[PDB]
Design a binder for this molecule. Sequence first.
Ligand SMILES: Nc1ncnc2c1ncn2[C@@H]1O[C@H](COP(=O)(O)OP(=O)(O)O)[C@@H](O)[C@H]1O
Ligand SMILES: Nc1ncnc2c1ncn2[C@@H]1O[C@H](COP(=O)(O)OP(=O)(O)O)[C@@H](O)[C@H]1O
Ligand SMILES: Nc1ncnc2c1ncn2[C@@H]1O[C@H](COP(=O)(O)OP(=O)(O)O)[C@@H](O)[C@H]1O
Ligand SMILES: [Mg+2]
Ligand SMILES: [Mg+2]
Ligand SMILES: [Mg+2]
Lengths: 372, 369, 370, 24
Amino acid sequence: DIAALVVDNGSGMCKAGFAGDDAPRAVFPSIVGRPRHQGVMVGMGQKDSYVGDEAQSKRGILTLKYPIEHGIVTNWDDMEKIWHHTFYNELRVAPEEHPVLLTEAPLNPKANREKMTQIMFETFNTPAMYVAIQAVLSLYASGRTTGIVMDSGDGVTHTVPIYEGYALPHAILRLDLAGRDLTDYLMKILTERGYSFTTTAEREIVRDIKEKLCYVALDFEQEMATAASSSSLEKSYELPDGQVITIGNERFRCPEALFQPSFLGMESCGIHETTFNSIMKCDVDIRKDLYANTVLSGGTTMYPGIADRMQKEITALAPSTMKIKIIAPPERKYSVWIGGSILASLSTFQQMWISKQEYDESGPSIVHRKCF
Amino acid sequence: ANQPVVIDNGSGVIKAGFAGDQIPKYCFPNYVGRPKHVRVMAGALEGDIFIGPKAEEHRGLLSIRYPMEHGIVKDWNDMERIWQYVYSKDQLQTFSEEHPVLLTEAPLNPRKNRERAAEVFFETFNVPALFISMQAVLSLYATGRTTGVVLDSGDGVTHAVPIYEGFAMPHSIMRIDIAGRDVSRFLRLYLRKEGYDFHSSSEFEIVKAIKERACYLSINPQKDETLETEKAQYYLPDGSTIEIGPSRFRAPELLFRPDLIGEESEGIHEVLVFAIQKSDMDLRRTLFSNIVLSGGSTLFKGFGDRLLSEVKKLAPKDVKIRISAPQERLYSTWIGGSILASLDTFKKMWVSKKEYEEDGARSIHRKTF
Amino acid sequence: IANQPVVIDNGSGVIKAGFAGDQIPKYCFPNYVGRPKHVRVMAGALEGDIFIGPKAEEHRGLLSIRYPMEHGIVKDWNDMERIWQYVYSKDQLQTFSEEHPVLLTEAPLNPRKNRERAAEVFFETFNVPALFISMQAVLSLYATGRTTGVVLDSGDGVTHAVPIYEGFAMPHSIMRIDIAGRDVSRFLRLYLRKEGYDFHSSSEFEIVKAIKERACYLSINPQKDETLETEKAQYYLPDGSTIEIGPSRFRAPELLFRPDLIGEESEGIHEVLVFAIQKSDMDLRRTLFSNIVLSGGSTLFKGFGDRLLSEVKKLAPKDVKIRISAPQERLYSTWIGGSILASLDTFKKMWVSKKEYEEDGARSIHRKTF
Amino acid sequence: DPKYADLPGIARNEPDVYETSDLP
Ligand SMILES: Nc1ncnc2c1ncn2[C@@H]1O[C@H](COP(=O)(O)OP(=O)(O)O)[C@@H](O)[C@H]1O
Ligand SMILES: Nc1ncnc2c1ncn2[C@@H]1O[C@H](COP(=O)(O)OP(=O)(O)O)[C@@H](O)[C@H]1O
Ligand SMILES: Nc1ncnc2c1ncn2[C@@H]1O[C@H](COP(=O)(O)OP(=O)(O)O)[C@@H](O)[C@H]1O
Ligand SMILES: [Mg+2]
Ligand SMILES: [Mg+2]
Ligand SMILES: [Mg+2]
């Protein structure tokens, strides 16, 4: 049995591994770094461009570019470099020997999937491949076939309802507010507090602060009043230099943009309102089941207390009789990958591959006929 | 002494004017814009609510909200503000106390919407009389024919109403909520699938302009779907271009195939043919030879050809079919309301202030239809 | 209080103080404190220890300079307090601080503690009747007399672009970078070291700044100019010696548009302008291109307007009108706008009273601004 | 114009408007 690779190209973080495994083998940020200085002589051991963790360690001098923005690959050369690093350097496997099950967010441009398939078949020459919706995989990981997945990662937050394995394409709701937007808002409020972060390298420091300290407030106004009237919520973080910086109310103002996009200037619904609207778009008979099987996914849903806040907000919006149950597994950050591995470990999935024969026969456009 | 005022309460564009005038003098979109950005300088734009051409001029500054959706008023405060603006100095400078009103409501609407509309138009505006009407009768009045089936496709609703010699069949009326605004929303989704995003409320009105300008109905769906299509380029207001491609013709097809948006409803052609067929047999031929189109949403390039093809497919073999339509379709309903309001017999159709004060909502239900 | 308010445009490089009635800033001087270079303990040396304003210019060779403000943020608060007290001196404004209300100017997106401490200093050390802190970008449109525009204020310390449409500001569209006149001066010092000329001293920072002001132009085609033999314009030092600046004349200001040449991770002036325009709502964008207002000293570079127009043209959508309204008075546009604002009766309702600050505390100065 | 004559840094001998060519 030739195991098929599973490569979740997240907007922020790329995960990769073999089908049937419990966790991804390689998990590295999806960044391409380049040296900043041009005129001066360059040292001995250097690369033209750094990828993944190598760019992260050397981020002090490098300037970082994310190939994927809002779930849309904008720099295909950089994404090709990321895939090359994933296959040859990290996984240490020949891409031509195994199929690859890539992932994409719903409602993305068609050209994105077409170019994905073209790059996989022409540059890498894989024997077959597949493109899967992230929410469907994350529902696969939770061991459910009915529920609503609110998967929120570095670039996009998409809500997908599914009933008994039957997706509902007309009820899917996508939002560009996720991750990177929260990191930028954290930069902004930090600048108001006094600590100025501007360079792309400092974006990683602000992201680490967001991961370590930030949390979702169950009641925003009460926590704001508590922060104003006391310093119990203040917490100190150590930068890579050694400087210690105190974060106060900004701990629970950065993730609050998830539930109030007006802070970010976008006139969009919050994640709770997006989930409620997606549920209400479904048929009346299945809505109850969705209320009982709301599943959180993606890395940006890892804030403490986000499950309680989402439960409270949906209970406020939803009818009183219906029972709300937000499912937030501890390992949900990798839930998009894990289900993909399950989808690659099934015996019935051997017919769902896009073989290279079919790609040559029909061209890239077959991705729109096979995958979704 | 006081000429009654005619207000066609469109979901997308409302048309107010005086009875007896040839065309609606005061037309403007049916939305309320509010300034999302923060005011910093003295002498900025005054007021936190922008309605009418002021909203259109400063559309980028504002966030838009639609008081009416699918022919039903959702935000009643905004609708009240809209009707108050209709009486304002900018458009139709009058006093609401003196002029009877002729408001138009889509057929088969909820009774509560009509009740609240009458309450607003009798309590907030102390009008002397009121009269609710459907779009179809007014369109027939405007065209000048008592006989015919009116298929009006507005921004919110699309309904077919057959009226034979001035007699309306209440049970044969057909209505679906898939209308021009739904086409615009579907076009926004397809443009997102193309690559261009218009998530802003203001940019939705750019998507609507794209729907108005660069969109057509292919005579046959699947042949056009199979064949490759040239990517016609559209110029956005800022200056940047967008290559639309298949979304040019895949968007308006929602009118004929509601299942594209997951809604299990009849198509516009199905609405028409079933509206004719629910009526008595002896009238059907006379209804097939008198089809009157209305509403802006029937102005798609090739709508007439596709509708004729669909009805010919669904209609009985060898029956005369002509799809009439006024030259200006947007103003047809208001012109009809004006022609109706000028009649002396319209005074008998009023719901007087004393009548509404005595009987209340029941009177509005007695004299409406 | 009915007395004439005092407007103090707080520049990182040059502060401009005056009364609101005047059409121009009657008083203006560099924003630094000059101390004696040597630690003076003997008599007969430069007494006082604190040289501010033209006094520091009189004996500029012998002084060590220290700017209080860096990147639009006050660093040495004692020095800034000294500066503000010197504004209320016999030399400048010849008046008591307690009589007149005050209008400050501050860069956008600055730390809240900076504004809080500035208000505390102006309300505690000076017994000012009131205070108001405005952004310079809002004031530039007041000065120009127009209701809409994109203000690109490139001062000494901070370069920021702010779009305003019909008096409505877009807080999320504001762009801000720290590459400004002082950074151009530092790069000019580096390039003059490459010419073979040393300006190590902090006092010599002033004369390299003077060289920047006197002979430095922005070339539309830097490659062609570099290939072309330079004229090697001669500049007179204060002491008397001449220097041939050479190609550095066009290399130092080029970092404003293309900072990455020196490895600086910054957007560039044309980039921040264009991205501030593009981040705004689409329908406004064309008008935002039709009303671009320059401000700040760094916009006074020779040929700056032409190069900025070229960059905006090649970045903006094709066949779109661009109007870089560059008034001749753009150096003092911010103060003139502050004066026009303070003249209005509406300003009476904007500044915070001393009792209001005492009662509400710090948060008042945060909330009355917006 | 002369009201700004006394100020040091008023940059003269330059145009006040840099704009692209008008199109009909
Ligand atoms: N423990 C955590 N707490 C808060 N935020 C987190 C945590 N872990 C990850 N994140 C956020 O989630 C984002 C990564 O999400 P991810 O699951 O990688 O989405 P994608 O798969 O689309 O890249 C990061 O930007 C990070 O800020
Ligand atoms: N030329 C056109 N092509 C396509 N759609 C159009 C055209 N003209 C108007 N419309 C659509 O018609 C709608 C207006 O319909 P209207 O007749 O005002 O409805 P109502 O009867 O509720 O007033 C708008 O939403 C617009 O999108
Ligand atoms: N003609 C000129 N050429 C080049 N630079 C100039 C010229 N005039 C002034 N400057 C620079 O502009 C800066 C003054 O900026 P300023 O307007 O004071 O900014 P702020 O908004 O902080 O007050 C000085 O540091 C000076 O170097
Ligand atoms: Mg993810
Ligand atoms: Mg209508
Ligand atoms: Mg200034």
